[PDB]
Structures are given as C-alpha cells and as structure tokens.
C-alpha cells in the first residue's frame, strides 16, 4: 500500500506561532495566570514576573 506518513498543517502552525508570540504574550497581566507549582517575585514590574 501507500508509504507510511504523518501530516502537519504548516501554515496554521506558522500563523499561531505569529499570533502567540506577537499578541498573546503582550496581553495585559489580568489575562495571564501563574502555573500550578511556579513562584514569581511579588514585584509585578520585574522580568521574572513578566
């Protein structure tokens, strides 16, 4: 039969890669959340927090 294969939507991946890094990461801090077991400094202006 046909050769074994797996399939990827490259264009949708490049578009999500554009949107996430260029827009999702820049949303106001109220849209974000802190992961289940990660600790961030209390100073919300630090790089570690952002």
């Amino acid at each position: 039969g046909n050769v074994y294969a797996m399939e990827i939507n490259l264009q949708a991946n490049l578009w999500k890669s554009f949107l996430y890094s260029n827009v999702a990461l820049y949303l106001p801090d109220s849209y974000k959340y802190t992961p289940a077991n990660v600790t961030l400094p209390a100073n919300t202006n630090t790089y570690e927090y952002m």
Binding site: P41, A42, N43, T44, T46
Partner: protein
C-alpha cells in the same frame, strides 16, 4: 601587529525600591483614640463598684 587588528579590541549607585509588593491608601480614619478613654473609664467603674461592695459590707 596583524590578523586580529582588523576589527577592534565602581562604588555605590544606591537604589531604594527593591523586590516588594505594591501599596494602596484610604481616608476614613481614627475613631480609636476614644476607646483608649472608654477602656480606662470603664476600668475605673469596675473598681468603683468593688468599693460599693466593701462600703456596704462594712455597715
């Protein structure tokens, strides 16, 4: 002389705000100076009526 030569080759700055939280305020302040007198008034009124036991028992 050649090969690499084509390119090129403090004390105290005294910050203050550091890694703590944000701060807020409000202006509805200060009943509290009255209780310091409430407390020490009512404290006297205790002793005043302990005396009113003694001054009736002594009769």
């Amino acid at each position: 002389a050649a090969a690499a030569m084509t390119a090129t080759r403090m004390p105290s700055s005294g910050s203050s705000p550091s890694v703590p939280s944000s701060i807020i305020a409000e202006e509805k302040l200060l009943a509290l100076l009255a209780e310091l007198e409430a407390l020490s008034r009512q404290l006297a009124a205790l002793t005043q009526q302990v005396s009113e036991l003694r001054e009736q028992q002594q009769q």
